[PDB]
Design a binder for this molecule. Structure first.
Ligand SMILES: [Mg+2]
Ligand SMILES: [Mg+2]
Ligand SMILES: [Mg+2]
Ligand SMILES: [Mg+2]
Length: 81
RNA sequence: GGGACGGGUGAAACAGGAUGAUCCCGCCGAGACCGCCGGCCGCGCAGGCGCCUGCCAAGACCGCCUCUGUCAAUCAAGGGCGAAGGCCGGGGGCUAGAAGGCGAUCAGACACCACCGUAUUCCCGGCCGUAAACGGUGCCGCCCCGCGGCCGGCGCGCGCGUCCCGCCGGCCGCCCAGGGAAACCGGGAGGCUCCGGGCUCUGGGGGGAGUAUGGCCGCAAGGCUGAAACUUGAAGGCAUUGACGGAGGGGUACCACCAGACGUGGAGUCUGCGGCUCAAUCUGACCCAACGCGCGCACCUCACCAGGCCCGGACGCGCGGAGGACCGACAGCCGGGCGCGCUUUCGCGAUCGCGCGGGCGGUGGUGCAUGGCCGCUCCCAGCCCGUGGCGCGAGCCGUCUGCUCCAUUGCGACAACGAGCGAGACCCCGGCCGCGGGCGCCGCGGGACGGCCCGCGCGAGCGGGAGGACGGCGGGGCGAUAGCAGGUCUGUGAUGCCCUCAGACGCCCUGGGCCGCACGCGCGCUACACUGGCGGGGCCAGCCGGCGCCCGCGAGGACGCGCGGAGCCCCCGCCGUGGCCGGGACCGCGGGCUGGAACGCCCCCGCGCACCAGGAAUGUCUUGUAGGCGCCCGCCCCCACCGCG
């Protein structure tokens, strides 16, 4: 469906800014594998994992198109001048 | 002139029309009225004031080195003005329109809507003297934050615009202090319990009652003034939370609608519900949220009706007792029956008898004394905490008048910040693939996420196309806070208080009843036929699952072993629109099963009821769904038109 509860959004944001290097803007498989990785997160279920991965994909392609509020993605380097 | 309707309403009907209406144009008559400009403009003591032209008197404001010199403020009595309606006497007569009449609507409608229409509405002369006559705020006078608009007059400045800087006067808006019960006022409702500028009027809980009785005024209608007895415990103001609205604005759902489908209410019958009857026909529940529901009533179950055995009276005190407490029996009757009772005489042995206290038990009452479990509100999306802030306070913000979502699901803001429950997540089932194991298909995992493309949208997210087993909440379970005088004391070693307790409401036996039938209605079943009924044959399921041989038309039965699945449908024939071979209620002979016991259930021959698709009224439903077809379990000695599947 389209139910993106608070948990999904908050978690996706949190795991994104700490892993911009290990993710990509449109893949669902590599994002899914990263979320399955234990060093970054612990998803007690499967469907939760898939939903989180999908929201991450949307979030990251939104970023690449342009900056997103609430994400401290190290962009200070481009704007520190 | 022209030729058929016109008027009026939500829709219509009364009045008008070939004697020419409605409609077009032109002329004539009379009487009202003064439009758009028209306003947080203005004038006036208030009531009130809007055509052109002319006349008469008046008024506030500003400007001033004009005059006088306290001449002032407020007021019983008294005087004058005073909307609309109304009255007297005269004029006038077009619009509207009290009264009246008539058509509709309604149960009624003498009212609201339609049409006709008198007084009145207009002018002169004169009475009346009331209005939510309201700023619901008396008049004179002083001080007082800030910003702004409009009107009239005067002055200053310049770059000369009907510019900007001021003064007086008036009409308005917002507002800091302060005030207040608050709404709110702030050009005071401020400067007041820190409670004294001057004058006048009014009020003292609610009704009775602005009534009675007097007086004055008035043609009248009526106005001014104005009690008591008696009665009563609240009546009122401003504000808060809910509920409600024939209020507005946004959303949503086949227990709502649109489009359609299948039905019920029509008959016969099964079952439950009220009424009648009876010895009894035991009782709970009555809109959704009672009525095949409280899991199949010949005995039990079982409570109710007519009759009878037993004590299974625990445990304590007093007395008595083996020189014999209590308990059983042949014959022969009475008795439904039994040593139940009776005419008698044999037994047994303290396991006790009687009285006084005290127990046990009871489908006995109260569900309006309770627990627990369910139902409903709710096929809902809502509910709250800590710190802080606003209010004397009940309370409010957080917890949203924007955009999305099935969803208080989210985005984005905000005297709020930060959390939590519910929702989702979660659990079971199914569909595709892999590994392993394997008497019998069953254990562990992968897979789908609004992920890709295109359009939009800041964003959350919306529409289309793909590829894919499956595409956007696939079917179920769980189920928030708060609550109902909802149901259950007849589910229980769950229970408070009552009532019964040795002719028992305890327990056990024999019968009867819960099923009786002039009547009203609730869930279902069978049919009304040819898109069919009968006869013969062929053939496939799943929750899951037991069979051979021999008798008998069959239903069933005697023996003996472990083995195993249907209706619709399809093919060939008969019948031929006839209440007929559709339908199978009712009744008359007969054969069997369960059981201690048929009133119960199966089979065979004959008889062959209502019924031609069902009035006012009403229910359910979106894919393997409706509908049609059958098959298993539950309760159960026998039996399913019911219920779960
Ligand atoms: Mg008048
Ligand atoms: Mg007054
Ligand atoms: Mg005082
Ligand atoms: Mg009084």
């Amino acid at each position: 469906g389209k139910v993106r509860t608070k948990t999904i959004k908050r978690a996706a944001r949190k795991i994104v800014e700490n892993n911009y290097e290990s993710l990509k803007p449109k893949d669902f498989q590599n994002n899914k594998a990263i979320c399955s990785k234990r060093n970054v997160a612990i998803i007690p279920s499967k469907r939760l994992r898939n939903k989180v991965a999908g929201y991450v994909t949307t979030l990251m392609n939104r970023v690449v198109k342009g900056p997103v509020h609430g994400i401290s993605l190290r962009l200070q380097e481009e704007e520190r001048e």
